[PDB]
């Protein structure tokens, strides 16, 4: 159940958690520049709450290569957010705008057919 692979961007889970904390620190420092340089309705506190929500969404993972993959894609999205290549519509894709909240109860899904 154990294989030897080539590590990507980490050699231990504490190092991977430390680099994820580097990613969170740089994202937290880049929040008020994102609110200032984009014409978005979301404020600084809402952006920080969304950043915390996207980190605790990926809280559940355990594997070193998977969490390093997540850190790499997060740093790429951050580099697309420091240099302004994303638009105001790309920034507001984290908040699910223009989407009706689907119900969770069985009765409303039964009436709506979902």
């Amino acid at each position: 159940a154990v294989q030897q692979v080539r590590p990507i961007l980490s050699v231990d889970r504490e190092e991977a958690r430390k680099r994820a904390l580097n990613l969170y620190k740089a994202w937290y420092r880049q929040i008020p520049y994102i609110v200032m340089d984009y014409d978005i309705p979301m404020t600084v506190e809402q952006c920080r709450d969304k950043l915390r929500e996207e980190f605790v969404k990926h809280r559940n993972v355990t594997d070193i290569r998977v969490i390093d993959m997540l850190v790499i894609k997060g740093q790429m999205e951050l580099k697309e957010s420091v240099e302004i290549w994303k638009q105001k519509g790309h920034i507001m894709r984290y908040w699910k705008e223009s989407q009706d909240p689907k119900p969770t109860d069985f009765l409303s899904k039964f009436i709506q057919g979902v």
Binding site: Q3, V5, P7, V66
Partner: protein
């Protein structure tokens, strides 16, 4: 420069699958059915995974069939069931197997049983 990892990974966060498709979709691993109006079997030996059918509705404007399911047309080929199990557990899909292949049907085809004495296997036509 190698590390130690478990051989079972979950690649559902690093893929592009949303939560509403990874949490409630059932994957059928199956051998596709042979067309009963054909005697060939070259399209049968390949295993494949497919997804469950979703709601397909009539278009309001024209008579076309519209579906909001993005994965209705995606069948992925595999050479063995166990590799499909490994793929479904690696990509985080909820899997089930429709049915294993038939191992062997032992049959004998003799031309002499069409014309037999005191046997009920004798044919009446030719």
């Amino acid at each position: 420069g190698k590390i130690t990892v478990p051989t079972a990974v979950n690649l559902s966060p690093i893929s592009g699958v949303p939560e509403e498709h990874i949490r409630e979709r059932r994957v059928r691993i199956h051998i596709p059915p042979k067309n009963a109006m054909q005697s060939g079997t070259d399209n049968v030996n390949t295993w494949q995974i497919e997804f469950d059918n979703r709601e397909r509705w009539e278009n309001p404007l024209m008579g076309w069939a519209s579906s909001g399911d993005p994965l209705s047309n995606m069948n992925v080929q595999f050479g063995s069931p166990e590799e499909a199990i490994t793929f479904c557990e690696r990509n985080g899909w909820r899997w089930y197997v429709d049915g294993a292949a038939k191992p062997k049907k032992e049959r004998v085809k003799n031309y002499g049983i069409n014309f037999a004495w005191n046997k009920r296997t004798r044919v009446s036509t030719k």
